[PDB]
Amino acid sequence: MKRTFQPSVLKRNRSHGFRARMATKNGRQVLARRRAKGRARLTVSK
Amino acid sequence: MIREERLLKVLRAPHVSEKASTAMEKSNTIVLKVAKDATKAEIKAAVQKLFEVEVEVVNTLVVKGKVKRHGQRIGRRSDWKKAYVTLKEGQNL
Amino acid sequence: RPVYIPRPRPPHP
Amino acid sequence: SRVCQVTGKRPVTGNNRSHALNATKRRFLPNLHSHRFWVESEKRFVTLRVSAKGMRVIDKKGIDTVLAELRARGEKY
Amino acid sequence: MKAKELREKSVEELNTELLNLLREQFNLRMQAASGQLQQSHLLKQVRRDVARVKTLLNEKAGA
Amino acid sequence: AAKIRRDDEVIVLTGKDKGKRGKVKNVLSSGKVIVEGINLVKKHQKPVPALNQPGGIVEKEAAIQVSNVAIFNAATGKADRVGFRFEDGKKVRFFKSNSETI
RNA sequence: UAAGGUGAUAUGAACCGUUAUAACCGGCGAUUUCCGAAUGGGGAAACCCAGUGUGUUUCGACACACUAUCAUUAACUGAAUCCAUAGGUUAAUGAGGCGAACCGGGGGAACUGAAACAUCUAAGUACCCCGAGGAAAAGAAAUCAACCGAGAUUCCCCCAGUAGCGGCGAGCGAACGGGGAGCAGCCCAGAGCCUGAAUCAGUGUGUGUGUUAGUGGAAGCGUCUGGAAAGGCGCGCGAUACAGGGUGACAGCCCCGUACACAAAAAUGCACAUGCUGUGAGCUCGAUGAGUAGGGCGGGACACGUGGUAUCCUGUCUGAAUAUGGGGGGACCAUCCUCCAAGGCUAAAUACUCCUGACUGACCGAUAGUGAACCAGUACCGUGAGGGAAAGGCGAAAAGAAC
RNA sequence: CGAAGGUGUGCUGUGAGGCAUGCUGGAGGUAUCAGAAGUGCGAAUGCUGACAUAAGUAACGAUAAAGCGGGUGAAAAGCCCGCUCGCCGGAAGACCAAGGGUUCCUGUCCAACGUUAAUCGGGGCAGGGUGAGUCGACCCCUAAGGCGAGGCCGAAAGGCG
Numbered sequence: 001m002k003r004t005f006q007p008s009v010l011k012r013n014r015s016h017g018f019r020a021r022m023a024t025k026n027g028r029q030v031l032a033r034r035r036a037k038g039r040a041r042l043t044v045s046k
Numbered sequence: 047m048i049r050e051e052r053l054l055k056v057l058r059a060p061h062v063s064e065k066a067s068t069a070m071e072k073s074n075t076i077v078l079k080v081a082k083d084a085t086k087a088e089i090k091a092a093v094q095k096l097f098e099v100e101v102e103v104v105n106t107l108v109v110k111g112k113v114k115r116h117g118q119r120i121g122r123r124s125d126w127k128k129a130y131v132t133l134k135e136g137q138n139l
Numbered sequence: 140r141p142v143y144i145p146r147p148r149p150p151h152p
Numbered sequence: 153s154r155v156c157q158v159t160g161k162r163p164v165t166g167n168n169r170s171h172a173l174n175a176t177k178r179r180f181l182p183n184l185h186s187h188r189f190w191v192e193s194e195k196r197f198v199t200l201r202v203s204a205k206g207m208r209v210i211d212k213k214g215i216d217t218v219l220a221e222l223r224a225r226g227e228k229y
Numbered sequence: 230m231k232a233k234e235l236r237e238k239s240v241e242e243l244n245t246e247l248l249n250l251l252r253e254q255f256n257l258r259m260q261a262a263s264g265q266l267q268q269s270h271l272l273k274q275v276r277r278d279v280a281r282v283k284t285l286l287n288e289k290a291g292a
Numbered sequence: 293a294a295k296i297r298r299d300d301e302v303i304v305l306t307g308k309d310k311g312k313r314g315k316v317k318n319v320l321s322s323g324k325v326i327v328e329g330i331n332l333v334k335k336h337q338k339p340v341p342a343l344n345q346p347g348g349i350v351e352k353e354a355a356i357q358v359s360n361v362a363i364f365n366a367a368t369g370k371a372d373r374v375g376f377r378f379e380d381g382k383k384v385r386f387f388k389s390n391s392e393t394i
Numbered sequence: 395u396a397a398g399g400u401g402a403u404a405u406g407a408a409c410c411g412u413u414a415u416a417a418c419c420g421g422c423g424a425u426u427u428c429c430g431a432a433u434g435g436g437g438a439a440a441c442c443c444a445g446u447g448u449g450u451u452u453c454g455a456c457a458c459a460c461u462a463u464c465a466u467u468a469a470c471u472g473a474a475u476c477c478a479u480a481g482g483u484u485a486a487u488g489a490g491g492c493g494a495a496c497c498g499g500g501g502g503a504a505c506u507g508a509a510a511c512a513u514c515u516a517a518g519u520a521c522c523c524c525g526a527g528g529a530a531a532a533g534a535a536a537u538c539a540a541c542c543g544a545g546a547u548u549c550c551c552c553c554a555g556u557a558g559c560g561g562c563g564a565g566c567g568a569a570c571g572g573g574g575a576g577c578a579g580c581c582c583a584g585a586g587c588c589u590g591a592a593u594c595a596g597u598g599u600g601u602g603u604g605u606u607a608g609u610g611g612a613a614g615c616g617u618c619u620g621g622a623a624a625g626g627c628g629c630g631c632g633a634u635a636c637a638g639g640g641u642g643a644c645a646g647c648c649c650c651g652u653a654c655a656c657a658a659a660a661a662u663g664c665a666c667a668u669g670c671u672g673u674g675a676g677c678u679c680g681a682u683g684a685g686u687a688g689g690g691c692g693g694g695a696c697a698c699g700u701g702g703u704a705u706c707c708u709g710u711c712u713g714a715a716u717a718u719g720g721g722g723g724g725a726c727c728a729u730c731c732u733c734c735a736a737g738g739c740u741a742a743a744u745a746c747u748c749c750u751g752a753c754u755g756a757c758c759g760a761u762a763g764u765g766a767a768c769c770a771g772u773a774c775c776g777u778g779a780g781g782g783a784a785a786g787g788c789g790a791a792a793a794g795a796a797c
Numbered sequence: 798c799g800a801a802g803g804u805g806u807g808c809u810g811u812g813a814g815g816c817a818u819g820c821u822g823g824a825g826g827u828a829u830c831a832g833a834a835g836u837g838c839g840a841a842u843g844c845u846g847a848c849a850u851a852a853g854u855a856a857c858g859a860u861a862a863a864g865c866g867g868g869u870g871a872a873a874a875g876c877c878c879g880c881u882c883g884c885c886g887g888a889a890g891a892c893c894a895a896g897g898g899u900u901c902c903u904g905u906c907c908a909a910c911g912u913u914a915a916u917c918g919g920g921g922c923a924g925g926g927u928g929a930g931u932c933g934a935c936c937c938c939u940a941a942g943g944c945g946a947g948g949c950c951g952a953a954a955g956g957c958g
Contacts, residue, residue, distance in 0.1 A: 004777080005776095005777065006525095006777095006896090007777090007895080007897085008894055008895075008896080009145055009438080009895090009896080010438070011777090012438085012777075013438035015777080015778080016778060016779090017438055017439080017779075018429095018430090018438085018439045018440095019437070019438070019439065020438085022430090022439085023943095023944080025954075025955090029724090030778095030779065031911095032492085032493095033779090033780095034541060034779095034780095035492095036493095036494090037771065038771055039771065040771080040772075043439085043441090044777090044778085045141055045143065045439075045440090046141075046143045046145065046438065046439090047449085047450055047456070047457060048456090048457065049450095049451075049455090049456060049457085050247065050451090051246075051250050054250045054251060054254070054255050055250075055427095057259075058254070058258070058262075059258065059259065059262030059263075060259070060262060060263065061862070062263075063924085063925060063926085064903095064925075065763085065925075077919085078264075087455080096255065098928095099286070104928095105928035105929080106928075107927060107928055108927085109926085109927075110142070110899080110927090112899065113140070113898085113899080114922095115921085115922095117403090119769085120140075122140050124284075128928090129928085130928055142898065143440085144438095144897090145443090145897095146814090146933085146934060146935095147894085147897090147933055147934055148927095148932085148933065148934085149893070149894070149932065149933050149934090150892080150893065150931055150932075151893095151933090152892070152893065153950080153951055153952070153953090154950095154951075154952085156534085161708095161709075162500095162952065163709080164693090164694090164708065164952085165500095165501070165502090165694095165711060165952080166693045166694065166708090166709075167505080167690080168692085168693080168695075169693080171693090172513070173512085173513045173514090173699080173867090174512070174513080174604060177501095177502085178692095178693085179709090179952080180692080180693075180708085180709035181709075182709065182710085183709085183710070183711095194478090194479080195478080196478090196479075203710095204710085205685080205710085205711090208685070208712095209685065212684080212685055213684095213685090214597095217630090219579065226466090226623085226831060230415090231415060232415080267407095267408075268408060268409080269407075269408050269409090270407095270408050270409045270410085271408090271409095272402090273400085273409095274409090274410090280425085282426060283424090284425075285427075287424055287425075288423085288424070292424095293395085293609085294398090294608095295395090295649080297397070297398095297609090298397060298398075298412080305648060306622075306623070306642075306648080307622070307642075307790095308621080308622070308642085309424085310622095318398090319397090319398080321398095321399095322465090323640080323649075323650085324791095330486080331791085331793095333791085333792085333793040334791060334793070335792080335794095335796090335797065336794090336795055336796040336797090338791085338795095338796070339796080346796095347796070347797090348797085349796050349797090350796090352793085352794065354791060354792090355791080356791085357640085357641055357642090357648095357649085357790090357791095358641090358648090358649070358683095359640075359641045359648050359649040359650090360641070360642090360648075360649095361648090361755085362648070363782085370615095371648090373613095373647095373648085375610090375611090376609085376610065376611095377610080378609090378610085383554055383609085383610095384415085388613090
């Protein structure tokens with residue numbers, strides 16, 4: 001039974017990585033929101 | 047020019063262990079700790095000057111710090127770099 | 140804590 | 153954008169009302185066109201995206217005067 | 230040990246820094262690692278001395 | 293601006309043994325002082341295989357609040373307070389009730 | 395300031411200092427790795443790879459600096475055609491990103507209410523986007539009023555659930571006028587006479603005050619109970635200090651504080667006087683904002699849903715007079731009254747608290763109060779946006795139980 | 798020479814309640830008269846925690862299978878050694894990539910974890926271990942595709958190139 005999550009570091013970084021968020025303004029707002037909440041992990045860091 | 051002071055900081059400490067001892071007595075090589083960057087050229091120059099010995103080749107590797115479970119908390123040790131330095135037929139220390 | 144160096148080490152088949 | 157380079161007219165949103173007074177959002181667009189104006193001071197043609205009202209404004213005033221105002225506005229033409 | 234070396238020329242300041250880095254900083258570090266050093270308070274004292282000399286060099290050279 | 297210092301002979305106002313005289317050895321940042329033969333504690337010292345093997349029960353000194361000890365006058369035969377005054381540009385301590393300099 | 399100290403969990407080891415450069419606190423400086431607007435190029439963030447210019451141990455190889463984009467300005471170059479322009483290079487100046495609310499503008503719902511529902515309401519609300527400030531916006535009548543008069547804007551209480559609007563349903567809802575807070579008026583569309591002539595902005599000096607370290611700061615003893623008293627009993631003293639906190643049970647007089655009186659080498663905000671720089675006083679004459687006002691068509695805003703609908707704004711098509719002129723006074727006309735649009739600047743009363751200090755509470759006291767009193771936005775869950783806990787209490791003192 | 802709270806007892810009022818006291822408790826409580834409420838719980842397939850029931854019941858995760866001797870140990874069917882037996886053998890063997898991130902090796906310990914015991918372990922604690930001019934990454938080149946100086950377009954954001 002193949003499950004939904006099939007890990008891949010390259011796909012994870014290129015999809016939800018820090019640079020991916022900064023590319024668009026919506027991603028920048030995502031980072032801004034999580035800085036405000038004080039989350040330790042801003043994004044998925046390798 | 048800060049080469050002299052740079053060479054005085056790349057070397058951190060010698061490494062003591064069973065592998066270190068057997069390597070010294072058999073292969074005439076010293077294993078020691080170096081800075082995180084510590085390029086092979088810098089290590090070679092530092093050993094030549096500070097220890098006043100002749101060296102043949104240097105091999106470096108990076109050791110990842112272990113994850114330790116101290117008390118109610120989880121911690122990690124710092125990564126460090128150790129270098130194997132192969133001395134020539136003339137050895138001092 | 141986080142390791143960031145998943146470099147490839149392919150031993151010759 | 154659909155902005156006149158002379159009068160500054162830009163599209164404005166509004167409503168359109170049916171017989172039953174139903175209101176749906178619409179948008180009014182300026183009557184923009186691309187026109188080449190001959191300028192004797194510089195002896196060449198300048199292309200401006202201007203509305204019909206703006207073209208009347210250019211005729212009433214001088215092309216040189218309008219260009220000066222555009223330059224003072226700070227936008228290249 | 231702060232104003233004693235304030236009036237020396239830049240040449241001596243570089244010389245004293247080199248011997249501070251050379252001896253009592255590298256040698257003490259090797260001694261401590263090998264376990265032959267019992268007076269560990271020298272390490273911090275030497276480090277602060279190196280900082281003092283560097284502070285003088287910056288306020289001497291250039292600005 | 294500490295009224296009780298390293299080398300002072302003091303007396304105890306309140307505690308297990310009030311009125312007992314002594315001399316302070318050290319003061320803690322938490323407003324506590326250590327004196328001889330005033331607050332003795334029979335600590336059960338465990339044995340250790342290191343260089344030191346005390347074993348048995350050790351009669352240690354327990355710190356006491358600085359507020360519970362007052363410097364002794366040594367002339368009037370009673371405890372007395374401490375005040376600060378400037379003399380020849382230096383701040384010095386003095387007693388009260390016919391105050392004299394320390 | 396100082397006889398103590400080397401941050402905490404957290405003891406130890408090795409040491410510094412005790413009359414002054416131990417430590418600690420404050421001002422001004424120095425250092426300030428890498429990522430991030432990231433800005434030399436690239437990139438899977440904390441990584442990879444460079445070019446040019448300055449100086450150096452074996453050529454080896456090193457150290458530093460510069461090198462993003464955009465806008466403006468200046469210089470040098472420079473096409474299709476002579477000139478020219480576009481374009482290119484160089485140097486300088488400014489911007490870039492982040493931040494809780496408040497402010498202005500550009501867009502703009504639905505649920506719901508109407509006991510259904512489409513006009514309407516919800517509502518110019520939520521939300522998205524842009525720009526600036528410590529406030530912002532608005533602001534010196536082409537305004538009201540009533541033919542009696544007031545004279546910028548803004549905010550609060552009335553007028554008033556009134557007049558009106560409205561499938562005249564649900565609902566929406568003024569103004570005039572009055573009482574207060576605070577008050578300040580100017581400049582260009584231009585010439586002449588007189589030319590620092592007031593007021594402003596930027597840089598020095600001096601006084602005062604405040605912030606950033608601090609200093610002194612009064613006065614209690616004896617017996618009883620008790621593990622220990624600050625309690626009971628008896629007799630005293632301080633108070634421009636019984637506000638608080640701590641101390642072995644409840645302290646004005648044990649400690650830190652408190653009222654009170656003082657303190658600044660150095661950096662700073664505020665109110666004044668005195669210098670410099672730059673625009674700029676006062677009088678005469680003239681001028682006095684045109685594709686605009688207004689109109690037709692379609693919409694929006696004014697309580698006012700096109701209705702008899704004034705007034706304002708605008709997409710589209712037209713289009714005056716210019717002071718012997720024009721606007722408004724709720725369809726419209728005449729007479730009267732009032733004002734002078736089509737160019738701008740302007741603090742005060744007003745809105746909010748991410749953050750700093752003090753103080754307060756018929757606010758909570760660990761299932762409460764912030765999600766978080768315990769290193770919580772953590773553990774943990776989710777690919778991701780995101781969601782999101784549980785967990786406080788020995789004793790006065792570890793004296794934390796030798797054997 | 799003992800507050801609140803807790804736990805019993807005895808009186809008392811038509812009631813919700815009140816009063817006195819034994820033991821634990823260890824430092825707070827509050828008359829009377831007024832004032833304000835987060836003011837009273839048995840139910841909402843209520844929310845949170847704790848603890849019952851079924852119950853010492855089902856189950857202990859491929860029907861490839863174990864037996865014995867010795868060793869260590871407080872304790873051995875499961876750990877170590879030895880001799881037999883059985884199972885896989887295009888795999889249930891040996892290698893990688895992806896993905897994990899010290900699970901690797903040695904010493905030591907058996908609380909919890911292991912669906913039982915455990916001296917054993919991918920468990921706890923400590924120490925050790927990853928060596929490249931030739932492998933790979935990095936690097937040079939490019940596919941799909943992404944970004945994109947100027948530029949075109951778009952109320953803003955932004956789209957395309």
